[PDB]
Amino acid sequence: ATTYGTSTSVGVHNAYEKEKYRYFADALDSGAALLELDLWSNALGRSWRVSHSNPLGNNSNCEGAANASELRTKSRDQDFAGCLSDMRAWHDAHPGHRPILLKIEMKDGFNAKGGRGPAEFDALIRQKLGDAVYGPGDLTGGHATADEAVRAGGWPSRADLAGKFLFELIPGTVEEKNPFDKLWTDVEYAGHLKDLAAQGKLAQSTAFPAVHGAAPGDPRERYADPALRPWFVVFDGDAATYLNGSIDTSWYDTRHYLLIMTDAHNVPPVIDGTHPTEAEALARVRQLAAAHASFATADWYPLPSVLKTVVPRGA
Numbered sequence: 001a002t003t004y005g006t007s008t009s010v011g012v013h014n015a016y017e018k019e020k021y022r023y024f025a026d027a028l029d030s031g032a033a034l035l036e037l038d039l040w041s042n043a044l045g046r047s048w049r050v051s052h053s054n055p056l057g058n059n060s061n062c063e064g065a066a067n068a069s070e071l072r073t074k075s076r077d078q079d080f081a082g083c084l085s086d087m088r089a090w091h092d093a094h095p096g097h098r099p100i101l102l103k104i105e106m107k108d109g110f111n112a113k114g115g116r117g118p119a120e121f122d123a124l125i126r127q128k129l130g131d132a133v134y135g136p137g138d139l140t141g142g143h144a145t146a147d148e149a150v151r152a153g154g155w156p157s158r159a160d161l162a163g164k165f166l167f168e169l170i171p172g173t174v175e176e177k178n179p180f181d182k183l184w185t186d187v188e189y190a191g192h193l194k195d196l197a198a199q200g201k202l203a204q205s206t207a208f209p210a211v212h213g214a215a216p217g218d219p220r221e222r223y224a225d226p227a228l229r230p231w232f233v234v235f236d237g238d239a240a241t242y243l244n245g246s247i248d249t250s251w252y253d254t255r256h257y258l259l260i261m262t263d264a265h266n267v268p269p270v271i272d273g274t275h276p277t278e279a280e281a282l283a284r285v286r287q288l289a290a291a292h293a294s295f296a297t298a299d300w301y302p303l304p305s306v307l308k309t310v311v312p313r314g315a
């Protein structure tokens with residue numbers, strides 16, 4: 001049987017977009033293993049916005065359903081709390097559902113000073129999803145760090161993660177463009193986990209920060225503070241880059257780290273990001289699995305059968 005660390009599965013980028021999925025419920029029902037959401041924390045006023053582009057209100061397929069009977073009924077363009085409500089409603093209506101990873105790009109990083117930092121992020125997810133989350137506290141157990149835990153014992157079996165949501169955080173594109181040196185999402189959230197762990201409060205955490213940007217060796221060497229490094233057990237980078245010869249991807253599989261490969265369609269020879277043939281997409285997923293991906297992501301909403309695919313990771 002596979003574990004969350006020994007399988008390869010498929011994700012949909014920007015799954016909150018109405019053009020892909022009329023309602024977020026449709027994204028949840030797609031069978032995809034990974035659904036990506038773009039969040040903004042530094043817009044004015046309350047709420048985490050959900051939007052591809054600079055937000056004006058929100059632009060999303062989330063409806064803030066109160067229960068499953070309300071799915072596919074309400075006005076959309078709801079915020080992050082709205083998406084989380086859809087998830088809870090859908091969750092309750094699908095006992096034992098496949099585990100789903102919500103990949104969160106914090107477009108503009110966190111906004112601690114405005115009440116939208118790591119702690120508030122966790123608190124909101126706890127409020128909306130409660131026991132349905134498998135977070136760093138769950139993986140880490142009695143171990144000193146997430147890294148120690150995952151290397152020694154790996155992830156639970158996929159069967160055991162039935163009915164669970166997981167969260168991945170990456171830094172955002174706007175964040176990468178800041179002329180100043182405000183801490184990025186990755187270091188900020190990893191530091192939050194480190195501080196929680198030191199305080200004996202890792203249980204209240206809700207998300208795994210990822211190292212974003214494919215790189216050779218141990219990508220966590222990019223962080224000057226070695227104390228932050230063992231809180232990163234997820235890595236997220238360009239598929240073609242991972243396959244270009246410069247990176248030993250077996251390293252991730254050996255250590256049971258999750259490896260998300262983005263723009264899976266751009267691996268040569270390129271295939272369509274949205275409407276490839278089923279055969280093309282499946283071959284691509286198998287290729288990336290052999291290359292030790294945990295997830296292959298693209299825009300393949302027209303191919304739910306492919307989105308549902310789960311195969312052995314590596315060999």
Ligand SMILES: [Cl-]
Binds near residue numbers: 003004005155256
């Ligand atoms: Cl594992």
